[PDB]
Scaffold this active site. Structure first.
Site, PDB file in Angstrom:
ATOM      1  N   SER A  72      -2.370 -52.968 -61.877  1.00 17.64           N
ATOM      2  CA  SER A  72      -3.617 -53.135 -61.157  1.00 17.64           C
ATOM      3  C   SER A  72      -3.410 -53.335 -59.690  1.00 17.64           C
ATOM      4  O   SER A  72      -4.356 -53.288 -58.943  1.00 17.64           O
ATOM      5  CB  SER A  72      -4.427 -54.316 -61.722  1.00 17.64           C
ATOM      6  OG  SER A  72      -4.848 -54.105 -63.052  1.00 17.64           O
TER       7      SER A  72
ATOM      8  N   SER B 230      -9.685 -57.136 -61.495  1.00 16.06           N
ATOM      9  CA  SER B 230      -8.940 -55.936 -61.850  1.00 16.06           C
ATOM     10  C   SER B 230      -9.673 -55.183 -62.966  1.00 16.06           C
ATOM     11  O   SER B 230      -9.149 -54.934 -64.055  1.00 16.06           O
ATOM     12  CB  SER B 230      -7.523 -56.232 -62.303  1.00 16.06           C
ATOM     13  OG  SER B 230      -6.799 -56.927 -61.304  1.00 16.06           O
TER      14      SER B 230
ATOM     15  N   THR C 137      -3.346 -59.238 -58.212  1.00 17.62           N
ATOM     16  CA  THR C 137      -2.477 -59.247 -59.355  1.00 17.62           C
ATOM     17  C   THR C 137      -2.416 -57.880 -60.014  1.00 17.62           C
ATOM     18  O   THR C 137      -3.300 -57.031 -59.889  1.00 17.62           O
ATOM     19  CB  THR C 137      -2.889 -60.262 -60.430  1.00 17.62           C
ATOM     20  OG1 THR C 137      -4.245 -60.015 -60.782  1.00 17.62           O
ATOM     21  CG2 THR C 137      -2.681 -61.718 -59.966  1.00 17.62           C
TER      22      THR C 137
ATOM     23  N   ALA D 278      -0.486 -56.459 -64.075  1.00 19.77           N
ATOM     24  CA  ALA D 278       0.419 -56.776 -65.158  1.00 19.77           C
ATOM     25  C   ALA D 278       0.268 -55.742 -66.243  1.00 19.77           C
ATOM     26  O   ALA D 278      -0.805 -55.157 -66.419  1.00 19.77           O
ATOM     27  CB  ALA D 278       0.086 -58.125 -65.738  1.00 19.77           C
TER      28      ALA D 278
HETATM   29  C1  LIG Z   1      -4.155 -54.471 -64.124  1.00 21.16           C
HETATM   30  O1  LIG Z   1      -2.990 -54.825 -63.985  1.00 21.16           O
HETATM   31  C2  LIG Z   1      -4.964 -54.587 -65.376  1.00 21.16           C
HETATM   32  N1  LIG Z   1      -4.134 -54.875 -66.517  1.00 21.16           N
HETATM   33  C3  LIG Z   1      -4.348 -54.241 -67.650  1.00 21.16           C
HETATM   34  O2  LIG Z   1      -5.222 -53.408 -67.757  1.00 21.16           O
HETATM   35  C4  LIG Z   1      -3.449 -54.396 -68.814  1.00 21.16           C
HETATM   36  C5  LIG Z   1      -3.623 -55.181 -70.052  1.00 21.16           C
HETATM   37  C6  LIG Z   1      -4.637 -56.215 -70.332  1.00 21.16           C
HETATM   38  C7  LIG Z   1      -4.230 -57.449 -70.827  1.00 21.16           C
HETATM   39  C8  LIG Z   1      -5.178 -58.398 -71.210  1.00 21.16           C
HETATM   40  C9  LIG Z   1      -6.535 -58.097 -71.077  1.00 21.16           C
HETATM   41  C10 LIG Z   1      -6.936 -56.849 -70.590  1.00 21.16           C
HETATM   42  C11 LIG Z   1      -5.984 -55.914 -70.195  1.00 21.16           C
HETATM   43  N2  LIG Z   1      -2.623 -54.782 -70.895  1.00 21.16           N
HETATM   44  O3  LIG Z   1      -1.901 -53.794 -70.306  1.00 21.16           O
HETATM   45  C12 LIG Z   1      -2.330 -53.480 -69.052  1.00 21.16           C
HETATM   46  C13 LIG Z   1      -1.630 -52.439 -68.224  1.00 21.16           C
HETATM   47  C14 LIG Z   1      -5.843 -55.814 -65.213  1.00 21.16           C
HETATM   48  N3  LIG Z   1      -5.123 -56.638 -64.304  1.00 21.16           N
HETATM   49  C15 LIG Z   1      -4.275 -57.636 -64.893  1.00 21.16           C
HETATM   50  C16 LIG Z   1      -3.980 -58.574 -63.793  1.00 21.16           C
HETATM   51  O4  LIG Z   1      -2.956 -59.296 -63.885  1.00 21.16           O
HETATM   52  O5  LIG Z   1      -4.593 -58.292 -62.729  1.00 21.16           O
HETATM   53  C17 LIG Z   1      -5.065 -58.223 -66.060  1.00 21.16           C
HETATM   54  C18 LIG Z   1      -4.112 -58.657 -67.180  1.00 21.16           C
HETATM   55  C19 LIG Z   1      -5.984 -59.361 -65.606  1.00 21.16           C
HETATM   56  S1  LIG Z   1      -6.048 -56.870 -66.653  1.00 21.16           S
END
Ligand SMILES: *C(=O)[C@@H](NC(=O)c1c(-c2ccccc2)noc1C)[C@@H]1N[C@@H](C(=O)O)C(C)(C)S1
EC number: 3.5.2.6
Length: 250
Positions: A45, A92, A190, A192
């Protein structure tokens, strides 16, 4: 500038790194783990920072834009609502990012990636899935190192990209999070995800610091590790960055 004494415990159990540079002079202020800093990984993200620049530049959004939710569950409760460019950035909201990429279109994204000199510039997506337009930055083909993210961020705050000046400053504004303990101002983002086909998590927290001293900085906190099935790698990367930044006189 080796800050391992402070950073090591924070990144224990992971392969972590931290970089802090003065935006104006490009002086390295603090570093932890240069080998991990040089390794390219999926931006996840944090690619929203680039998408925001593109969207504002291409004039497909403005600060009054409301992204309209389709009423269907998106995976996270905070995603299940309308959004603005600010809340898109803050939370995100992946479906907004995907609305934006579909609107700009592949070749124009590639052109922006080339203008931004961004990572491996590989927007092909997953092997055999033709899903690059909406997935390439999410644990997929597109990769960028922490050191490269530093210099991308530096270009942004120094207006050394061929986009509207307003596109830059609206995106920076929308990253603002809080002030730190000595009033320095934090603008961050952020990202992840899990590593494709593996159990490892990757996390980022990166952005800008503006000090009351006058100085501006760019930073990147990033890690990869087995942290279980709860995606906490960006929580940790963020925590660590804030802890480390508050120990410093900027
Ligand atoms: C960007 O990094 C986005 N991440 C995700 O879409 C993500 C998830 C996820 C986990 C839990 C809930 C929803 C999505 N699993 O794999 C991926 C690639 C969004 N940003 C992250 C952040 O750290 O900014 C999240 C986890 C908040 S979601």
């Amino acid at each position: 500038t080796d800050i391992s004494t402070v950073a090591s415990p924070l990144f224990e159990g992971t392969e972590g790194c931290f970089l802090l540079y003065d935006a104006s002079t490009n002086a390295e202020i603090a570093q932890f783990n240069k080998a991990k800093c040089a390794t390219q990984m999926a931006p996840d993200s944090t690619f929203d920072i680039a998408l925001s620049l593109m969207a504002f530049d291409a004039e497909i959004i403005d600060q009054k834009t409301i992204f309209k939710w389709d009423k269907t569950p998106k995976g996270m409760e905070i995603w299940n609502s309308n959004h603005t460019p600010k809340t898109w950035m803050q939370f995100s909201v992946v479906w907004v990012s995907q609305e934006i990429t579909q609107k700009i279109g592949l070749n124009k994204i590639k052109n922006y990636l080339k203008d931004f000199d961004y990572g491996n510039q590989d927007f092909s997506g997953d092997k055999e899935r033709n899903n690059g337009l909406t997935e390439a930055w999410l644990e997929s083909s597109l990769k960028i190192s922490p050191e490269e993210q530093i210099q991308f961020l530096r270009k942004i705050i120094n207006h050394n990209l061929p986009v509207k000046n307003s596109a830059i400053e609206n995106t920076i504004e929308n990253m603002y999070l809080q002030d730190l303990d000595n009033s320095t101002k934090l603008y961050g983002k952020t990202g992840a995800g899990f590593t494709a086909n593996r159990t490892l998590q990757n996390g980022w927290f990166e952005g800008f610091i503006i000090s009351k001293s006058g100085h501006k900085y760019v930073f990147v906190s990033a890690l990869t590790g087995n942290l279980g099935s709860n995606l906490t790698s960006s929580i940790k990367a963020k925590k660590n960055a804030i802890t480390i930044l508050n120990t410093l006189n900027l």
